[PDB]
Design a protein around this ligand. Structure first.
Ligand SMILES: *C(=N)[C@H](C[C@@H]1CCNC1=O)NC(=O)[C@H](CC(C)C)NC(=O)c1ccc(-c2ccc(OC)nc2)cc1
Ligand SMILES: *C(=N)[C@H](C[C@@H]1CCNC1=O)NC(=O)[C@H](CC(C)C)NC(=O)c1ccc(-c2ccc(OC)nc2)cc1
Lengths: 304, 304
């Protein structure tokens, strides 16, 4: 077959997207059971975002100051509370389209599907990876806040991300479904910096395994390299260091293609030191790191 | 914001995917109203695919030889007919989740979202462009046949593609929802060739307009070029020729960024003649042509 960046089917997540309005600010919310989740900066006007005291701002707000809309139907808010940077709205109606769901906190290097929403209506879907500096490279316009990232395990939806803000470099930052920010960011219109972003090495190796599976084999040498010799070279080229845990995740991929992981590191070492010389790998002139080993096995088996 | 490859929300299409079994072959079908659509080679065994006579093969089949499954529920087939390369199954139950839909035949250069399915169950979603040689670059394993490509206009689903086969070069080919193949292909396990694939120039220019919008402006020169001088250079580098119709589609993008289309062609002319010198545009070391002018305005406005 081929290899493409693939997002999970967004059907179950679509039924949980609602519109949350507080004053003039409007963003998206997540309606699960009788609770609506949305970023807390919806209670902010344009001037509070520079330096907000969310404790004093939410104290002035009552239940009727929150307008929740599921389509053209208004939900009655009967309770509200603030958990970290996420504001929780209790409603009088349980969402009938609630799927089996979990609240998880992903780790750097893992991927998830993003459902970009505006005014509580789905607009598109794309796949995103959690960078080592806890940022993401998405597409988020005004009002996209409250859009959620998720994974799907057959019938269970693992919500893991909520969009909150954009950084000066154009990358995006957000929280989990418990309100805790990924990284050292705060929901305030101020100059915030992300760390030096590095390359997810275990994801590059998984992507190269997908290349060999699909036909692209010109980069395959027969040179070899120790796990330590590759790690010192990977640090020069701004790559995450490879641990034995990382080599075990690439195990199923190693035993299937007949390519030992240590030999895969040697081909990657040469590609990093000698460049690509204008060639392409899976239709790309750069080394992709947004494919986890799980994503490759996902696409090479059709988990459906 | 940022710029990403974005697929339409697959919620409405998910409710129309069923499993179609005939003998030992199993693929996916599209259940709209009381009709199920699926590729006709489901009536083929492994040996007929080399040289099938679908007229004689379907004549031996009756209604009860077709097993249609919507989840764990069996649909009763009460009628069947063959329209070009698509086999149509009339069922006794109208799909309650049928959205407002149309059957369209897209043109080369236009894009659509692909919902990859296996055994009638959705697996993932990604965006695909119709190459000038009427092929697509997707991800399709065994049993993925019957997966459909579609566009969404607010509440209307425009079905336009159905997957049928893979070519020797690894690219994929299929039909519209009327059974007519895109290109000069036939549903038979034989050596088939696609034409020389060329680059969709109007899509590259739209992608460069999205780059200027998002910050990437290093490629912006102030050189100029006539529509004819660019077309003769575009033919050397295997690019589609630009017509006045193409310049009109880039109009809204031209009047918004203050960059005339003729100046955009000059910057593209230099990028084609002088390379990229190791730089990147929107995080890519190649010129992307899978973004139509409509897709760029779609993402720069949030059509939702
Ligand atoms: C939510 N609807 C919106 C989505 C943002 C806006 C457009 N694209 C996005 O990703 N989020 C916001 O408006 C939030 C609201 C705060 C209260 C959390 N803020 C930002 O997204 C944001 C903050 C700061 C800056 C910024 C950039 C450079 C700079 O230089 C000194 N200073 C500040 C940008 C955006
Ligand atoms: C449908 N489930 C399946 C999807 C294909 C298989 C795996 N990936 C895909 O995209 N489609 C098929 O099995 C169809 C069935 C026919 C009857 C339409 N066939 C092919 O996909 C197919 C035909 C021919 C060749 C081929 C390649 C090289 C070659 O060299 C001489 N000769 C033939 C490959 C695949």
């Amino acid at each position: 077959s081929g290899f493409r960046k693939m997002a999970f089917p967004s059907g179950k997540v679509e039924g949980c997207m609602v519109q949350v309005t507080c004053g003039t600010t409007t963003l998206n919310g997540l309606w699960l059971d009788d609770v609506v989740y949305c970023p807390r900066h919806v209670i902010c006007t344009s001037e509070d975002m520079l330096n907000p005291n969310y404790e004093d701002l939410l104290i002035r707000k009552s239940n009727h100051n929150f307008l929740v809309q599921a389509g053209n139907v208004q939900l009655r808010v009967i309770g509200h509370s603030m958990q970290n940077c996420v504001l929780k709205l209790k409603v009088d109606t349980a969402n009938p389209k609630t799927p089996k769901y979990k609240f998880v906190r992903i780790q750097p290097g893992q991927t998830f599907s993003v459902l970009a929403c505006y005014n509580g209506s789905p607009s598109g879907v794309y796949q995103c990876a959690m960078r080592p500096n806890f940022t993401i490279k998405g597409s988020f316009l005004n009002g996209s806040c409250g859009s959620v990232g998720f994974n799907i395990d057959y019938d269970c939806v693992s919500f893991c991300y909520m969009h909150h803000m954009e950084l000066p470099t154009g990358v995006h930052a957000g929280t989990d479904l418990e309100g805790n920010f990924y990284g050292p960011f705060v929901d305030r219109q101020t100059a915030q910096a992300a760390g030096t972003d590095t390359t997810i090495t275990v994801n590059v190796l998984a992507w190269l395994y997908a290349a060999v599976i699909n036909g692209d084999r010109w980069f395959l040498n027969r040179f070899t390299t120790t796990l330590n010799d590759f790690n010192l070279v990977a640090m020069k080229y701004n790559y995450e260091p490879l641990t034995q845990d990382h080599v075990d995740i690439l195990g199923p991929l190693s035993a299937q293609t007949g390519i030992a992981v240590l030999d895969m590191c040697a081909s990657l070492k040469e590609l990093l030191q000698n460049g690509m010389n204008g060639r392409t790998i899976l239709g790309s002139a750069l080394l992709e790191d947004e494919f986890t080993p799980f994503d490759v096995v996902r696409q090479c088996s059709g988990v459906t």
